[PDB]
Amino acid sequence: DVPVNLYRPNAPFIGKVISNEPLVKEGGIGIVQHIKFDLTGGNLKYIEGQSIGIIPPGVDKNGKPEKLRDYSIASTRHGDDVDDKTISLCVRQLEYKHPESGETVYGVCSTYLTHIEPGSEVKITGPVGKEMLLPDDPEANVIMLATGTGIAPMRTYLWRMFKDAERAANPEYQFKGFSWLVFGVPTTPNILYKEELEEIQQKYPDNFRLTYAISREQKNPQGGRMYIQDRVAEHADQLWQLIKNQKTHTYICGLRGMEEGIDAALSAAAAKEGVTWSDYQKDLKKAGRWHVETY
Numbered sequence: 001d002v003p004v005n006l007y008r009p010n011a012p013f014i015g016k017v018i019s020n021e022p023l024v025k026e027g028g029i030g031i032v033q034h035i036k037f038d039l040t041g042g043n044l045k046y047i048e049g050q051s052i053g054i055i056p057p058g059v060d061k062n063g064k065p066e067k068l069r070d071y072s073i074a075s076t077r078h079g080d081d082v083d084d085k086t087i088s089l090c091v092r093q094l095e096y097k098h099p100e101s102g103e104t105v106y107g108v109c110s111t112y113l114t115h116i117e118p119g120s121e122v123k124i125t126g127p128v129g130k131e132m133l134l135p136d137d138p139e140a141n142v143i144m145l146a147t148g149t150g151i152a153p154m155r156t157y158l159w160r161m162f163k164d165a166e167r168a169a170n171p172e173y174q175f176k177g178f179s180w181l182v183f184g185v186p187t188t189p190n191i192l193y194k195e196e197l198e199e200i201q202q203k204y205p206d207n208f209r210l211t212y213a214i215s216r217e218q219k220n221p222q223g224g225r226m227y228i229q230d231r232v233a234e235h236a237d238q239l240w241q242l243i244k245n246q247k248t249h250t251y252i253c254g255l256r257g258m259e260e261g262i263d264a265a266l267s268a269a270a271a272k273e274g275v276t277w278s279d280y281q282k283d284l285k286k287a288g289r290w291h292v293e294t295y
């Protein structure tokens with residue numbers, strides 16, 4: 001039922017870019033693009049929580065072809081237009097430091113993708129992933145802990161849950177549980193999909209809670225910058241109570257290293273009731289209720 005490896009690196013699907021939109025508003029930090037591809041002409045199917053591979057053009061420094069990079073799918077199974085013809089990605093351009101040979105370094109695949117033109121052909125493989133899948137139980141609670149481009153799988157869940165067109169397209173899934181996104185970004189113009197996230201929250205104030213951790217605008221109790229582990233510590237007892245429900249699924253996505261501050265906060269909460277969090281969490285992973293994808 002879960003499509004996997006419909007296309008592989010030795011014979012990739014050749015899609016076409018339909019659009020390439022900026023997500024970072026003026027005054028923000030960096031470049032994050034929303035890129036939509038045309039899937040017509042092939043049989044690429046996917047569901048929510050999966051990834052695809054992109055094979056960038058060119059050779060490395062040794063003259064060898066560039067390998068694929070993985071990207072979380074940022075659209076539901078139906079695509080943004082709910083026509084089952086497209087797939088979207090949420091791609092940040094990577095760039096960095098002088099302690100790494102010379103001046104500024106730009107990432108190969110992320111630069112390629114963020115500057116790609118409509119009409120261009122792209123090599124796509126996949127889909128892959130069974131770790132970040134959404135339960136078909138419409139009464140599930142869904143906690144979502146994302147930083148930056150980790151919003152991508154969260155967007156596929158929330159759109160499936162709350163978009164009018166999706167609800168009309170998925171008769172089997174009419175969500176009536178509770179979902180909570182805690183979203184860590186550096187500035188307000190860096191809140192990816194801010195307007196659509198806040199529109200969901202106003203239509204479904206009982207089913208969706210939105211919490212931001214904006215580090216350049218908010219300070220934590222110790223006077224430091226507000227990060228997502230600070231918000232999670234702030235709400236640790238509430239999050240723990242929701243996690244005790246047999247229906248609750250937790251998803252964590254973003255850059256590696258966000259997991260340690262989340263566990264330290266949930267450990268202190270669980271300890272209050274004599275529960276050892278690290279042992280409890282192993283049973284949650286075994287049960288398929290604890291989903292992690294950091295990179």
Ligand SMILES: Cc1cc2nc3c(=O)[nH]c(=O)nc-3n(C[C@H](O)[C@H](O)[C@H](O)COP(=O)(O)OP(=O)(O)OC[C@H]3O[C@@H](n4cnc5c(N)ncnc54)[C@H](O)[C@@H]3O)c2cc1C
Pocket residue numbers: 051069070071072073090091092093094095096097100106107108109110111149150152293295
């Ligand atoms: C499952 C999965 C899902 C992903 N989803 C997404 C997504 O939705 N959106 C997205 O933008 N990315 C996503 N990523 C990362 C994406 O995989 C590519 O790794 C990332 O875009 C950078 O690739 P690059 O090709 O731009 O190239 P590269 O040119 O390959 O650069 C990466 C290399 O440069 C180095 N490097 C990186 N940062 C620094 C730093 N600050 N200081 C020093 N050296 C550094 C490391 O050696 C690293 O191997 C995902 C990764 C995985 C594994």
